[PDB]
């Protein structure tokens, strides 16, 4: 099926308390495999999955140096954005960057993306054609001009379509026993009364990978797909009933939908 | 595999 490799970056400026708190996490589909925390003791990129540990120390050296480069840029960014918006040097601010590359069933490059935020609001983002930028305000318009000058989109497009895809396939092979293997949801049902004549029937969905799943009652109170901690995910959907509308569990790990 | 440091400041 389809596969995606993503990276999430967060830098929170702390007024007069040192370098900004930089935190980076890397995902293959719904499985995190790398981590970097500026306040950590190791000062290096760390694994979060057993299969990525097969990479030698040369891999971890490179990933550590350029995750620090990402923190180096986000630090200048926070000071630059403080000047763009004429904000005080005593306030705490946040930058968030996320990019990645998707492959299809043929494992060839499918879609790419890159989004950048400041204080939780959208700042600048890369279009689906990987050629132009979309600026939210006049400050981001300056960054768009700045990045257009050095043709950053072309360099980013080259990374998303080549290096990002090549290493996505490489991770999928090394972690084939966990990444390419699906985990079907173990479903059960509970029943509870709520009012004088009505009751609530909950359709549970426990321990499944990937997290993509749909749970509805058609011919419905449902919560966020939450992690269990063991790499699998959970979800439940309920409805108050006094069954023409049934619970249909649909998941990639199931050959046919369950009811 | 992180991309190289080709991004300048904002």
């Amino acid at each position: 099926g389809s596969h995606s490799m993503r990276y999430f970056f967060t830098s929170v400026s702390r007024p007069g308390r040192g370098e900004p708190r930089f935190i980076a996490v890397g995902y293959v589909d719904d499985t995190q495999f790398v981590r970097f925390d500026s306040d950590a003791a190791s000062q290096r990129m760390e694994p979060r999955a057993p299969w990525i540990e097969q990479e030698g120390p040369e891999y971890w050296d490179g990933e550590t140096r350029k995750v620090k480069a990402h923190s180096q840029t986000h630090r200048v960014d926070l000071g630059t954005l403080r000047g763009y918006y004429n904000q005080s040097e005593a306030g705490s601010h946040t930058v968030q960057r996320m990019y990645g590359c998707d492959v299809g069933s043929d494992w060839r490059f499918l879609r790419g993306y890159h989004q950048y935020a400041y204080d939780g609001k959208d700042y600048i983002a890369l279009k689906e054609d990987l050629r132009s930028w979309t600026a939210a305000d006049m400050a981001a318009q300056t960054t768009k001009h700045k990045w257009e000058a050095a043709h950053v989109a072309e360099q980013l497009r080259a990374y998303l379509e080549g290096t990002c895809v090549e290493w996505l396939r490489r991770y999928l092979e090394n972690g084939k026993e966990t990444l390419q293997r699906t985990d079907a949801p173990k479903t059960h049902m509970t029943h509870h009364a709520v009012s004088d004549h009505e009751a609530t029937l909950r359709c549970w969905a426990l321990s499944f990978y990937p997290a993509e799943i749909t749970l509805t009652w058609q011919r419905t109170e449902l919560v966020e797909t939450r992690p269990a901690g063991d790499g699998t995910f959970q979800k439940w959907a309920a409805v108050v009933v006094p069954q023409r509308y049934t619970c249909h569990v649909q998941h990639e790990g199931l050959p046919k939908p369950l009811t | 595999f992180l991309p190289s440091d080709f991004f300048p400041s904002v």
């Epitope: 480069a69 180096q72 840029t73 630090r75 200048v76 630059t80 300056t142 001009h145 700045k146 257009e148 000058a149 050095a150 043709h151 072309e154 360099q155 | 190289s4 440091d5 080709f6 991004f7 300048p8 400041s9």
Partner: antibody
Framework: EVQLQQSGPELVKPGASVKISCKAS????????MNWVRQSHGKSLEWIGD????????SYNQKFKGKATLTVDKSSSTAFMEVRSLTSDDSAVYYC???????????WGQGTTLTVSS | EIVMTQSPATLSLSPGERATLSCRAS???????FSWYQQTPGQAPRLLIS???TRATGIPARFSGSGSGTDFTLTISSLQPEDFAVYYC?????????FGQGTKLEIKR
């Protein structure tokens, strides 16, 4: 060959304005941003601003914002810079520097000496 | 603003020797947005090293650049009579783009 032909030197009384020409040749004029650098006599280089030839978009050094204005003419593949309210502190050599495709200033013009005196 | 500092101001060496110029940035700068320039008195500047290591078109093999973060170094393998000029370092990484004060290479005798 990539060539940046700037305009000749100018002597101007204080308080007037001048516009420097910079003709580009030997490459696709819309593929590269154009910068302007000022160099005072016996001093170092100073970036003024850049121009996007495709749409006229500009970014300026904060000090020069209000002093220099950047325009471009894609028809004649020329970049211009207007320097208003001239003072003796504007007396310097001005260059147009093409921005490299991915960064840096690869090609520079021959420079134009601007002298401001009463 | 990222300040670029070069040292020493004037570096007096003999023709045919190695030359090592330095450039200290007040803030962390990506190596992809660091450049070296050579300028002869009376002539326009010329790009030597782009990307803090990549030589520009036409630049002789005796020139070389290196460094990262806030430290960078220009290296000339053998000093030639043309190589005795003024050298600048810049960063095109954060607005405003800034240069260094420069360093003049003088023939020692």
């Amino acid at each position: 060959e990539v060539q940046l032909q700037q305009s000749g030197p100018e002597l101007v009384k204080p308080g007037a304005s001048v516009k420097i020409s910079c003709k580009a040749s030997g490459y696709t004029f819309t593929d590269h941003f154009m910068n302007w650098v000022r160099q005072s006599h016996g001093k170092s280089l100073e970036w003024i601003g850049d121009i996007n030839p495709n749409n006229g978009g500009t970014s300026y050094n904060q000090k020069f914002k209000g002093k220099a204005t950047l325009t471009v003419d894609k028809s004649s593949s020329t970049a211009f810079m207007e320097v208003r309210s001239l003072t003796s502190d504007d007396s310097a050599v001005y260059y147009c520097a093409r921005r490299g495709y991915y960064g840096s200033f690869d090609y520079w013009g021959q420079g134009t000496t601007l002298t401001v005196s009463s | 603003e990222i300040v670029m500092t070069q040292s020493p101001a004037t570096l007096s060496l003999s023709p045919g020797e190695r030359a090592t110029l330095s450039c200290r940035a007040s803030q962390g700068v990506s190596s992809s947005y660091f450049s070296w320039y050579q300028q002869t008195p009376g002539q326009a500047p010329r790009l030597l090293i782009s990307g803090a290591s990549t030589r520009a078109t036409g630049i002789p093999a005796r020139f070389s650049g290196s460094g990262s973060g806030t430290d960078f170094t220009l290296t000339i393998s053998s000093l030639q009579p043309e190589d005795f000029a003024v050298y600048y370092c810049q960063q095109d990484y954060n607005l405003p783009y800034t240069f260094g004060q420069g360093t003049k290479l003088e023939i020692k005798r």
